[PDB]
Design an enzyme around this catalytic site. Sequence first.
Site, short mmCIF file in Angstrom:
data_model
loop_
_atom_site.label_atom_id
_atom_site.label_comp_id
_atom_site.label_asym_id
_atom_site.label_seq_id
_atom_site.Cartn_x
_atom_site.Cartn_y
_atom_site.Cartn_z
N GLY A 43 0.81 -1.21 0.00
CA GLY A 43 0.00 0.00 0.00
C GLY A 43 0.84 1.25 0.00
N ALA B 12 1.17 9.27 1.85
CA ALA B 12 1.86 10.44 1.28
C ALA B 12 3.35 10.38 1.61
CB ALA B 12 1.24 11.72 1.83
N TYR B 13 3.68 9.85 2.80
CA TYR B 13 5.04 9.71 3.33
C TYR B 13 5.87 8.67 2.58
N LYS C 223 7.22 -0.53 6.36
CA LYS C 223 6.74 0.81 6.03
C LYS C 223 8.00 1.63 5.79
CE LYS C 223 3.82 4.66 7.49
NZ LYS C 223 3.01 5.25 8.59
N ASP D 214 -7.58 8.56 12.96
CA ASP D 214 -7.69 8.29 11.53
C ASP D 214 -8.35 6.95 11.30
OD1 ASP D 214 -7.52 9.01 8.85
OD2 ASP D 214 -5.41 8.36 8.62
N1 LIG Z 1 1.18 -4.16 8.46
C1 LIG Z 1 0.70 -4.58 7.30
O1 LIG Z 1 0.66 -5.80 6.99
C2 LIG Z 1 0.17 -3.55 6.34
C3 LIG Z 1 0.28 -2.17 6.52
N2 LIG Z 1 -0.25 -1.25 5.70
C4 LIG Z 1 -0.91 -1.66 4.60
N3 LIG Z 1 -1.47 -0.72 3.81
C5 LIG Z 1 -1.72 0.65 4.25
C6 LIG Z 1 -1.91 1.58 3.06
C7 LIG Z 1 -2.33 2.98 3.51
C8 LIG Z 1 -3.57 2.91 4.38
N4 LIG Z 1 -3.34 2.03 5.54
C9 LIG Z 1 -2.97 0.67 5.13
C10 LIG Z 1 -1.13 -3.05 4.33
C11 LIG Z 1 -1.83 -3.69 3.26
C12 LIG Z 1 -1.77 -5.05 3.31
C13 LIG Z 1 -2.42 -6.03 2.43
C14 LIG Z 1 -3.11 -5.62 1.29
C15 LIG Z 1 -3.74 -6.56 0.47
C16 LIG Z 1 -3.70 -7.91 0.78
C17 LIG Z 1 -3.00 -8.29 1.90
F1 LIG Z 1 -2.96 -9.61 2.23
C18 LIG Z 1 -2.37 -7.39 2.74
S1 LIG Z 1 -0.88 -5.60 4.71
C19 LIG Z 1 -0.54 -3.99 5.21
#
Ligand SMILES: NC(=O)c1cnc(N[C@H]2CCCNC2)c2cc(-c3cccc(F)c3)sc12
EC number: 2.7.11.1
Length: 269
Positions: free
Chosen positions: A15, A18-19, A37, A129
């Site tokens: 995903g 903005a950062y 991240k 948020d």
């Molecule tokens: N810690 C994480 O695993 C994690 C953290 N941030 C994510 N995206 C942000 C984007 C901005 C908004 N907040 C979420 C996502 C998206 C993920 C995911 C997507 C599709 C399929 C799948 F299996 C997993 S995992 C994950």
Amino acid sequence: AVPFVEDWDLVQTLGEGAYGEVQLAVNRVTEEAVAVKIVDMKRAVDCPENIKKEICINKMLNHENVVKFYGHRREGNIQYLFLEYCSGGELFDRIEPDIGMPEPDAQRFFHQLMAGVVYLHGIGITHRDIKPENLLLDERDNLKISDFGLATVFRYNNRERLLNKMCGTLPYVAPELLKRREFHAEPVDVWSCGIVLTAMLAGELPWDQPSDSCQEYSDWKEKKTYLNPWKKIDSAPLALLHKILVENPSARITIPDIKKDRWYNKPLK
Ligand SMILES: NC(=O)c1cnc(N[C@H]2CCCNC2)c2cc(-c3cccc(F)c3)sc12
């Protein structure tokens, strides 16, 4: 992150914000997966202080409905935060546009969301948020609150402070952010939880913003629940939404009273 990328495959982007971006990292030997991240601190002068705050908040968290934070490290102007990979993805992608999802599913996710928010509030943290894009799912579809980039402390020991920052995603924001100079933190998160519940039940956000100039919000203040998205929502969850989406934050339902709500406690199919 040269030694790290020799052993770990940054398989794909999960995903973006903005950062920066979130990548899926898989260790070539163990096949362990972690989410990374990646933040470019050059995006803003206050980004180094903001990421320091997000890490600080992340270090305080330990709950079954909050994404686990493993650690972090800086390499030049780039910050790397290592998080538990939530293989079920975003709650957003379980919401069928204009439809939502089955009522038992929305109820279960809502109970898990309340458990996470109670935990955060109990340690004096406000998320600010809450939205389906920031609610992730693990491999058993358990909900995990994610993305603490806007989170802040509203209670120091047993002493509350009011907040004054206008932040969050506008369709999820409580009306007091657009009307009061200062406000209590907890009712704001309660309000955004109500918008998430509305989206899960009918697959549609009810208004652009809860402001004087938004006709869809005036419609809701006028109890026009025969209009979309409300007309797609059964009277039992709608009665809960009528208590959550209350304009005056001092009259708004608190989480202890949400846990007493008839629909919250309703045995579903
Ligand atoms: N810690 C994480 O695993 C994690 C953290 N941030 C994510 N995206 C942000 C984007 C901005 C908004 N907040 C979420 C996502 C998206 C993920 C995911 C997507 C599709 C399929 C799948 F299996 C997993 S995992 C994950």
